[PDB]
Amino acid sequence: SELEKAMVALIDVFHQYSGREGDKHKLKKSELKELINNELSHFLEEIKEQEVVDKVMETLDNDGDGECDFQEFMAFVAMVTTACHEFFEHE
């Protein structure tokens, strides 16, 4: 399905990128920024000064430690996806 195929791929990126940090399951801050660029470096060319890459650590980090988990992996693309398009509207 739509999320089905995107689940097998997006998941491969969670363990792949998380693999950079010694083990392979969570992202070490900079690991997240990578996915935002190496993966989101066309739709959202913002960042550079830590816009969604720095704000993410706030949400993406729901455990407090620096180790990103799957829950933050999808919730991450969630913000950087719409969150980025939100840069236009700001309450």
Added chain:
Amino acid sequence: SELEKAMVALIDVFHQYSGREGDKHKLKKSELKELINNELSHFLEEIKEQEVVDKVMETLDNDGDGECDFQEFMAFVAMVTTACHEFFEHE
């Protein structure tokens, strides 16, 4: 790209499933359930008697009303993805 291609797919399920029954931006407990199967019918099968579809309605719920948001959209697949995956891990 992995997150790029999957980004347009998931995003298509938000504006697509959101335009199923009136409204066109959030998913009600019903629009979400569908995404669970209509999109996650592999490792989640037809839901497990309201297992992740019930718990999600609590989070995916913008704030209790029946309208999921984009941030909760991807974050949702985050749990239903691993949340239901790790489930298999018995003992």
